[PDB]
């Protein structure tokens, strides 16, 4: 049963310091387990389990050009939780180093370097993760559903809740069989990229989950985020960066859907410093973003990487409406072209660490022209707590609307585009 | 084999009449070096730490350059922030490093190999740069201090006399004080009256046969296994903190214990009323120390799964667990009944547990043939054979038959006081060590 | 050959315009069971130089 | 304060629901607002009850008037404070020897 | 459960030690006959127990059938956690007296939630506006009520020794 | 009760120690220790320690018992950097009239 094994999870492993200190090792235990099993029942897929330091170098070499980790002959962790509760730490912090050889090609690694040894001596430190590793091994896993654990677990108290996800999924993606998908500025996580393999198995696979974040803490365990899904390898990366100062990938590619969740209003000193009046991308807004305000900075970033076919979901504090020129020249620029084509409100607070709502805006190189203002404060069932959960069937109401620009009152409907540059530019 | 002598060795003067400070020296490093040992010259302070960066190459078999010497220095083994108590614990508590290299991999470094401890090198040097000092330098850090004396110099106020440069002097854990006719030794305890002689010990043989001169001592404790065993498996760094450093009869005792358990485990015996055996060690003891160490060297002895001090409770559940968790770390309750003593069979790795008599008779006899049956156990008694030929002792000859079942007595029940219950004939048959 | 993992890999040719040892999906295409240890190209690189001759013959054209 | 908050289901959830008129205390540090129970209404989380032992001389709605014949050392809630004692104790002034005639 | 191990002040020698496993409530008679004695009347050695609280190794086994009334008197989850009742108390007579005033958080688990329970639940302090009512340190006023009045944490709920 | 406060100097006429958190009236009890026959003692408390159980109880009564305790004042809340209760000032004396002016 599913919530059996999650409330395993969710007890056994909280001993006995801060969520986010142990969060790493509990992570790393279980991320070595998932690469453990995913290589024995790869080379046992004819039922040579227990395996010998025999290993065939030209053969060693094909899941490193496959996989990009060959693990050991015997350093995995079936054999080294048995052979546990013994002396001593640093087998496994020469077996991180090890299956990290993997130079050629796409490496895509450098990786496990989160795990440590503290700790405050070292046989309270053997103690400690022999009892995480065997606490690792005490999981009814088995064989495919190995992500939803970790899906729990990166859901601690202190992120972009499921439902939200799968409908910024939803919205992007739908009469569109093309290629290439999908582009994420400032991911966070995995979480919201994840929502596509979780349906778009089915006809081919596409391109890779590209993306893009700032905190290295968080681009670790949003690497292994969609590594556990038992996506394949190759183009299917995240870079590490800030996305308005170092932007890549500038050559590649217009995309045909894009989705992010950018944080409220982080600072940057940017305008105007370099050429940013005068780069790519922020040129034809006519200025740039102002000095605390990011958002727009991001949608334009966004709208720079978008074909003639696709079409971008993106999401906004509700904030962003007039807030002076500055605000209303973008706000100009976007609804000067047939950019925008929708935005979507939704109820407070729907968030972890938040208390003002969110709105979402979809913005498409595809004319009709008309901008479909369709909001929603209720439902969105924001009763049981916190604002748990705007369920299925549920969001189909609102994808049903967005189908061909229906206009349904209780509920929004399409404006004039003489009505919208009449009124000064509203959301 | 063992570690306090059953055979006295042959005592004889040399003399060298004892009024002097250099011929026992002399004599001292020709003994010590007809022991197998090293004698070095470091008229210095940086060149001892010097050796200290060649002796450890040995005993961990890596190499360092100066730049990592440099941070393993510095920050770990001398730093100036330091005094005697944390590098105490350094000693017995954290004595392992775990040192990044500029190669970048995690390794541990030692400083006294414990398990196989043949390998941890001795060396012995003598004063440089106050009174008269020879050393026992074990693996370049000094340990042993061989302090001298004369007759003039009474043992009471040899003591009584003399109670950053240098730093590595800190790591001193004995004062082997003698004189030329008496020899005792204690560890960093250093007041005036109560730290006098009465605290310091005469090492002695294995009944009662104490030992005086240089020459005997010599030949008896500074051997490599015994002095190594005296420093490493036999000393307490309680949490005070303080060190206690047990009484000679009593690793007499605990030696007993353990070569009884390992010449029985290998010609595959348990259950046998000669399997057992019962030591006799009244008051005045510590007899929570000596059951401690025997105890606790049981667990990690790897023939064994569960080690059961057991006694009867009149508030000894309370006190005895109290003194337990003195010596800081680890004992498992047998508190507070048989549901969850279940649970304490089922744990390991701090295989001591500490319960009653009356909670293991609930336990066994009830509860339908525990699984913790076949594991091989070690029970250590209070009030023994020569105390009791109890009713749980023989639910015990019913029930249990892979345990070493050894106890300890106060006042014995010989044949000369036998008002109570009966000797020990066909329970725990030999006496195996006694003090008196 | 797996028939619609060949329609994969036709479509993934058509796209690329190449191939290479990436591709990291590219053993349960091969027929029965090539993930096992001993593996003695059965049928990897040959089936492999018969992919890459067929994209050389319909480089552009099909 | 205002007596309704809005509807609840009134069953399986250890429900006192409110028999034939007892009266209530609100609140920790408020010792204030009475209130006779109206029809069949809930317990919610402050309604500590005040009823009777007897039922032949008291009509406790009498007392349920006869709070207000204390508002006098009950109108200064100062501190901190729980006053269990004060309404526990004594005194009201009482038409007995009159029981229960 | 809740059981003594009650022979004997005769054999203080203990060789072969009788008595084992008396619930409640106890005779003196049955218990006498089955553990002997020392020709004459001095028992109840109370060497082992398993009781919820702390007893002495000399008391009268009329104390001990006293005791046992007002601890079977309670409900479970007080009597899962007398010893931390105790911490507070000093006997079972005086946590017979104030029986009903001790408020018990099955819901609450921390400090956090006791707040949050006195605030939103209740209204101890007033009506709750909705634009106010993310804006309300919790962690402080938990504080307060901490050092204002006297809360006891177990791992059932929160129990609250009212005045 | 690790150490033998309970046979201390100043803490063995109240009876008890205080509690394992609640520090307040241990200092009271300090403060008695070290008063004469003549001065008088003026502390603050916070009005929090009020009955707060039996073990609180007792050290009130040890305190009313003789006629160590003199005069409380009430003051008014906040009146303070960095807090938000009121406070309480207890008066005490080896000084007999004997009544408790409880001056509000």
Same mark, same amino acid.
């Given at each position: 049963?599913?919530?059996?094994?999650?409330?395993?999870?969710?007890?056994?492993?909280?001993?006995?310091?801060?969520?986010?200190?142990?969060?790493?090792?509990?992570?790393?235990?279980?991320?070595?387990?998932?690469?453990?099993?995913?290589?024995?029942?790869?080379?046992?897929?004819?039922?040579?389990?227990?395996?010998?330091?025999?290993?065939?170098?030209?053969?060693?070499?094909?899941?490193? =050009?496959?996989?990009?980790?060959?693990?050991?002959?015997?350093?995995?962790?079936?054999?080294?939780?048995?052979?546990?509760?013994?002396?001593?730490?640093?087998?496994?912090?020469?077996?991180?180093?090890?299956?990290?050889?993997?130079?050629?090609?796409?490496?895509?690694?450098?990786?496990?370097?989160?795990?440590?040894? @503290?700790?405050?001596?070292?046989?309270?430190?053997?103690?400690?993760?022999?009892?995480? @590793?065997?606490?690792?091994?005490? %999981?009814?896993?088995?064989?495919?559903?190995?992500?939803?654990?970790?899906?729990?677990?990166?859901?601690?108290?202190?992120?972009?809740?499921?439902?939200?996800?799968?409908?910024?999924?939803?919205?992007? $993606?739908?009469? =569109?069989?093309?290629?290439?998908?999908?582009?994420?500025?400032?991911?966070?996580?995995?979480?919201?990229?994840?929502?596509?393999?979780?349906?778009?198995?089915?006809?081919?696979?596409?391109?890779?989950?590209?993306?893009?974040?700032?905190?290295?803490?968080?681009?670790?365990?949003?690497? $292994?985020? $969609?590594? @556990?899904?038992?996506?394949?390898?190759?183009?299917?990366?995240?870079?590490?960066?800030?996305?308005?100062?170092?932007?890549?990938?500038?050559?590649?590619?217009?995309?045909?859907?894009?989705?992010?969740?950018?944080?409220?209003?982080?600072?940057?000193?940017?305008?105007?410093?370099?050429?940013?009046?005068?780069?790519?991308?922020?040129?034809?807004?006519?200025?740039?973003?102002?000095?605390?305000?990011?958002?727009?900075?991001?949608?334009?970033?966004?709208?720079?990487?978008?074909?003639?076919?696709?079409?971008?979901?993106?999401?906004?504090?509700?904030?962003?409406?007039?807030?002076?020129?500055?605000?209303?020249?973008?706000?100009?620029?976007?609804?000067?072209?047939?950019?925008?084509?929708?935005?979507?409100?939704?109820?407070?607070?729907?968030?972890?660490?938040?208390?003002?709502?969110?709105?979402? %805006?979809?913005?498409?190189?595809?004319?009709?022209?008309?901008?479909?203002?369709?909001?929603?404060?209720?439902?969105?069932?924001?009763?049981?707590?916190?604002?748990?959960?705007?369920?299925?069937?549920?969001?189909? =109401?609102? $994808?049903?609307?967005?189908?061909?620009?229906?206009?349904?009152?209780?509920?929004?409907?399409?404006?004039?585009?003489?009505?919208?540059?009449?009124?000064?530019?509203? @959301? | 084999?063992?570690?306090?002598?059953?055979?006295?060795?042959?005592?004889?003067?040399?003399?060298?009449?004892?009024?002097?400070?250099?011929?026992?020296?002399?004599?001292?490093?020709?003994?010590?070096?007809?022991?197998?040992?090293?004698?070095?010259?470091?008229? *210095?302070?940086?060149?001892?730490?010097?050796?200290?960066?060649?002796?450890?190459?040995?005993?961990?078999?890596?190499?360092?350059?100066?730049?990592?010497?440099?941070?393993?220095?510095?920050?770990?083994?001398?730093?100036?922030?330091?005094?005697?108590?944390?590098?105490?614990?350094?000693?017995?508590?954290?004595?392992? #490093?775990?040192?990044?290299?500029?190669?970048?991999?995690?390794?541990?470094?030692?400083?006294?190999?414990?398990?196989?401890?043949?390998?941890?090198?001795?060396?012995?040097?003598?004063?440089?740069?106050?009174?008269?000092?020879?050393?026992?330098?074990?693996?370049?850090?000094?340990?042993?201090?061989?302090?001298?004396?004369?007759?003039?110099?009474?043992?009471?106020?040899?003591?009584?006399?003399?109670?950053?440069?240098?730093?590595?002097?800190?790591?001193?854990?004995?004062?082997?004080?003698?004189?030329?006719?008496?020899?005792?030794?204690?560890?960093?305890?250093?007041?005036?009256?109560?730290?006098?002689?009465?605290?310091?010990?005469?090492?002695?043989?294995?009944?009662?046969?104490?030992?005086?001169?240089?020459?005997?001592?010599?030949?008896? #404790?500074?051997?490599?296994?015994?002095?190594?065993?005296?420093?490493?498996?036999?000393?307490?760094?309680?949490?005070?903190?303080?060190?206690?450093?047990?009484?000679?009869?009593?690793?007499?005792?605990?030696?007993?214990?353990?070569?009884?358990?390992?010449?029985?485990?290998?010609?595959?015996?348990? *259950?046998?009323?000669?399997?057992?055996?019962?030591?006799?060690?009244?008051?005045?003891?510590?007899?929570?120390?000596?059951?401690?160490?025997?105890?606790?060297?049981?667990?990690?002895?790897?023939?064994?799964?569960?080690?059961?001090?057991?006694?009867?409770?009149?508030?000894?559940?309370?006190?005895?667990?109290?003194?337990?968790?003195?010596? *800081?770390?680890?004992?498992?309750?047998?508190?507070?009944?048989?549901?969850?003593?279940?649970?304490?069979?089922?744990?390991?790795?701090?295989?001591?547990?500490?319960?009653?008599?009356?909670?293991?008779?609930?336990?066994?006899?009830?509860?339908?043939?525990?699984?913790?049956?076949?594991?091989?156990?070690?029970?250590?008694?209070?009030? #023994?054979?020569?105390?009791?030929?109890?009713?749980?002792?023989?639910?015990?000859?019913?029930?249990?038959?892979?345990?070493?079942?050894?106890?300890?007595?106060?006042?014995?029940?010989?044949?000369?006081?036998?008002?109570?219950?009966?000797?020990?004939?066909?329970?725990?048959?030999?006496?195996?060590?006694?003090?008196? | 050959?797996?028939?619609?993992?060949?329609?994969? +890999?036709?479509?993934?040719?058509?796209?690329?315009? +190449?191939?290479?040892?990436?591709?990291?999906?590219?053993?349960?295409?091969?027929?029965?069971?090539?993930?096992?240890?001993?593996? +003695?190209?059965?049928?990897?690189?040959?089936?492999?130089?018969?992919?890459?001759?067929?994209?050389?013959?319909?480089?552009?054209?099909? | 304060?205002?007596?309704?908050?809005?509807?609840?289901?009134?069953?399986?959830?250890?429900?006192?629901?409110?028999?034939?008129?007892?009266?209530?205390?609100?609140?920790?540090?408020?010792?204030?607002?009475?209130?006779?129970?109206?029809?069949?209404?809930?317990?919610?989380?402050?309604?500590?009850?005040?009823?009777?032992?007897?039922?032949?001389?008291?009509?406790?709605?009498?007392?349920?008037?006869?709070?207000?014949?204390?508002?006098?050392?009950?109108?200064?809630?100062?501190?901190?404070?729980?006053?269990?004692?004060?309404?526990?104790?004594?005194?009201?002034?009482?038409?007995?020897?009159?029981?229960?005639? | 459960?809740?059981?003594?191990?009650?022979?004997?002040?005769?054999?203080?020698?203990?060789?072969?030690?009788?008595?084992?496993?008396?619930?409640?409530?106890?005779?003196?008679?049955?218990?006498?006959?089955? /553990?002997?004695?020392?020709?004459?009347?001095?028992?109840? &050695?109370?060497?082992?127990?398993?009781?919820?609280?702390?007893?002495?190794?000399?008391?009268? /086994?009329?104390?001990?059938?006293?005791?046992?009334?007002?601890?079977?008197?309670?409900?479970?989850?007080?009597?899962?956690?007398?010893? &931390?009742?105790?911490?507070?108390?000093?006997?079972?007579?005086?946590?017979?007296?104030?029986?009903?005033?001790?408020?018990?958080?099955?819901?609450?688990?921390?400090?956090?939630?006791?707040?949050?329970?006195?605030?939103?639940?209740?209204? &101890?302090?007033?009506?709750?506006?909705?634009?106010?009512?993310?804006?309300?340190?919790?962690? &402080?006023?938990?504080?307060?009520?901490?050092?204002?009045?006297?809360?006891?944490?177990?791992?059932?709920? /929160?129990?609250?020794?009212?005045?």
């Amino acid at each position: 049963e599913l919530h059996r094994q999650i409330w395993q999870i969710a007890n056994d492993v909280r001993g006995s310091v801060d969520g986010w200190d142990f969060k790493q090792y509990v992570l790393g235990a279980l991320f070595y387990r998932f690469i453990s099993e995913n290589f024995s029942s790869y080379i046992e897929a004819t039922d040579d389990i227990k395996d010998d330091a025999i290993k065939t170098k030209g053969y060693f070499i094909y899941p490193s =050009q496959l996989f990009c980790n060959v693990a050991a002959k015997a350093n995995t962790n079936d054999r080294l939780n048995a052979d546990l509760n013994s002396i001593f730490v640093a087998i496994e912090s020469s077996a991180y180093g090890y299956p990290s050889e993997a130079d050629i090609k796409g490496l895509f690694a450098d990786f496990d370097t989160t795990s440590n040894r @503290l700790g405050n001596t070292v046989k309270d430190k053997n103690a400690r993760l022999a009892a995480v @590793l065997k606490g690792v091994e005490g %999981l009814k896993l088995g064989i495919d559903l190995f992500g939803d654990a970790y899906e729990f677990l990166i859901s601690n108290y202190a992120f972009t809740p499921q439902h939200v996800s799968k409908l910024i999924a939803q919205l992007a $993606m739908h009469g =569109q069989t093309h290629v290439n998908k999908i582009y994420d500025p400032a991911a966070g996580s995995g979480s919201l990229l994840l929502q596509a393999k979780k349906q778009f198995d089915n006809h081919i696979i596409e391109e890779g989950f590209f993306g893009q974040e700032i905190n290295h803490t968080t681009y670790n365990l949003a690497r $292994m985020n $969609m590594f @556990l899904h038992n996506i394949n390898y190759d183009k299917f990366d995240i870079k590490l960066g800030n996305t308005l100062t170092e932007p890549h990938f500038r050559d590649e590619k217009p995309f045909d859907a894009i989705v992010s969740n950018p944080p409220y209003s982080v600072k940057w000193i940017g305008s105007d410093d370099p050429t940013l009046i005068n780069d790519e991308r922020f040129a034809p807004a006519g200025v740039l973003a102002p000095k605390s305000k990011a958002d727009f900075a991001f949608v334009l970033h966004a709208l720079n990487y978008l074909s003639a076919k696709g079409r971008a979901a993106i999401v906004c504090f509700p904030g962003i409406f007039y807030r002076g020129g500055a605000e209303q020249k973008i706000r100009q620029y976007l609804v000067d072209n047939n950019y925008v084509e929708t935005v979507i409100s939704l109820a407070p607070n729907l968030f972890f660490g938040t208390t003002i709502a969110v709105n979402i %805006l979809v913005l498409s190189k595809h004319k009709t022209d008309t901008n479909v203002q369709f909001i929603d404060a209720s439902e969105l069932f924001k009763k049981e707590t916190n604002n748990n959960i705007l369920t299925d069937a549920h969001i189909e =109401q609102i $994808m049903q609307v967005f189908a061909s620009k229906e206009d349904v009152a209780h509920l929004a409907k399409s404006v004039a585009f003489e009505t919208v540059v009449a009124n000064d530019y509203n @959301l | 084999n063992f570690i306090v002598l059953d055979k006295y060795i042959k005592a004889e003067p040399t003399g060298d009449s004892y009024q002097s400070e250099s011929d026992l020296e002399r004599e001292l490093i020709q003994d010590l070096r007809n022991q197998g040992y090293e004698f070095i010259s470091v008229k *210095s302070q940086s060149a001892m730490l010097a050796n200290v960066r060649e002796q450890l190459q040995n005993l961990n078999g890596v190499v360092f350059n100066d730049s990592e010497w440099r941070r393993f220095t510095e920050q770990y083994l001398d730093n100036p922030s330091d005094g005697i108590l944390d590098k105490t614990r350094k000693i017995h508590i954290d004595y392992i #490093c775990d040192f990044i290299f500029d190669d970048e991999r995690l390794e541990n470094i030692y400083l006294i190999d414990k398990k196989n401890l043949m390998r941890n090198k001795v060396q012995i040097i003598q004063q440089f740069e106050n009174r008269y000092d020879v050393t026992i330098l074990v693996n370049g850090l000094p340990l042993v201090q061989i302090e001298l004396k004369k007759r003039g110099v009474a043992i009471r106020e040899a003591f009584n006399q003399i109670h950053s440069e240098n730093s590595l002097f800190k790591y001193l854990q004995l004062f082997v004080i003698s004189n030329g006719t008496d020899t005792r030794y204690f560890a960093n305890t250093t007041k005036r009256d109560k730290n006098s002689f009465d605290f310091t010990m005469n090492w002695a043989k294995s009944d009662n046969t104490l030992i005086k001169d240089l020459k005997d001592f010599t030949a008896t #404790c500074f051997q490599k296994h015994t002095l190594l065993n005296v420093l490493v498996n036999y000393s307490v760094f309680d949490s005070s903190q303080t060190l206690l450093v047990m009484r000679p009869y009593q690793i007499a005792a605990t030696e007993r214990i353990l070569w009884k358990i390992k010449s029985s485990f290998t010609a595959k015996n348990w *259950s046998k009323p000669e399997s057992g055996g019962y030591i006799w060690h009244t008051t005045g003891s510590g007899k929570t120390l000596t059951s401690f160490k025997a105890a606790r060297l049981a667990t990690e002895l790897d023939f064994i799964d569960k080690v059961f001090f057991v006694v009867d409770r009149k508030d000894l559940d309370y006190q005895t667990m109290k003194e337990y968790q003195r010596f *800081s770390p680890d004992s498992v309750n047998g508190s507070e009944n048989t549901a969850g003593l279940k649970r304490n069979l089922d744990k390991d790795d701090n295989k001591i547990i500490v319960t009653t008599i009356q909670k293991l008779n609930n336990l066994m006899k009830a509860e339908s043939d525990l699984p913790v049956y076949n594991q091989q156990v070690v029970f250590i008694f209070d009030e #023994c054979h020569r105390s009791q030929f109890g009713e749980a002792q023989k639910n015990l000859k019913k029930k249990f038959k892979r345990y070493y079942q050894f106890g300890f007595t106060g006042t014995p029940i010989f044949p000369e006081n036998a008002l109570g219950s009966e000797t020990t004939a066909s329970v725990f048959g030999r006496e195996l060590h006694s003090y008196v | 050959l797996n028939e619609d993992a060949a329609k994969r +890999y036709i479509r993934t040719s058509l796209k690329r315009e +190449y191939a290479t040892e990436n591709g990291t999906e590219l053993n349960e295409t091969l027929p029965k069971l090539s993930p096992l240890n001993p593996q +003695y190209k059965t049928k990897k690189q040959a089936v492999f130089q018969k992919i890459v001759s067929f994209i050389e013959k319909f480089k552009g054209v099909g | 304060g205002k007596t309704f908050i809005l509807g609840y289901t009134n069953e399986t959830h250890g429900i006192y629901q409110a028999s034939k008129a007892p009266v209530i205390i609100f609140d920790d540090f408020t010792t204030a607002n009475k209130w006779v129970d109206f029809d069949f209404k809930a317990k919610s989380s402050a309604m500590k009850m005040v009823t009777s032992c007897d039922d032949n001389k008291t009509l406790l709605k009498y007392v349920y008037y006869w709070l207000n014949t204390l508002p006098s050392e009950f109108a200064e809630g100062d501190h901190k404070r729980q006053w269990i004692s004060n309404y526990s104790q004594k005194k009201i002034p009482i038409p007995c020897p009159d029981n229960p005639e | 459960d809740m059981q003594v191990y009650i022979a004997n002040l005769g054999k203080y020698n203990e060789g072969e030690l009788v008595g084992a496993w008396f619930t409640f409530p106890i005779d003196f008679e049955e218990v006498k006959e089955k /553990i002997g004695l020392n020709d004459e009347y001095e028992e109840y &050695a109370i060497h082992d127990y398993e009781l919820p609280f702390t007893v002495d190794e000399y008391t009268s /086994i009329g104390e001990l059938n006293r005791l046992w009334e007002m601890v079977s008197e309670l409900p479970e989850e007080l009597q899962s956690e007398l010893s &931390a009742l105790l911490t507070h108390f000093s006997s079972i007579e005086e946590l017979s007296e104030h029986q009903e005033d001790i408020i018990i958080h099955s819901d609450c688990d921390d400090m956090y939630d006791v707040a949050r329970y006195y605030i939103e639940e209740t209204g &101890a302090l007033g009506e709750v506006p909705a634009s106010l009512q993310n804006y309300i340190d919790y962690q &402080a006023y938990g504080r307060d009520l901490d050092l204002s009045g006297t809360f006891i944490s177990t791992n059932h709920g /929160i129990f609250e020794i009212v005045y």
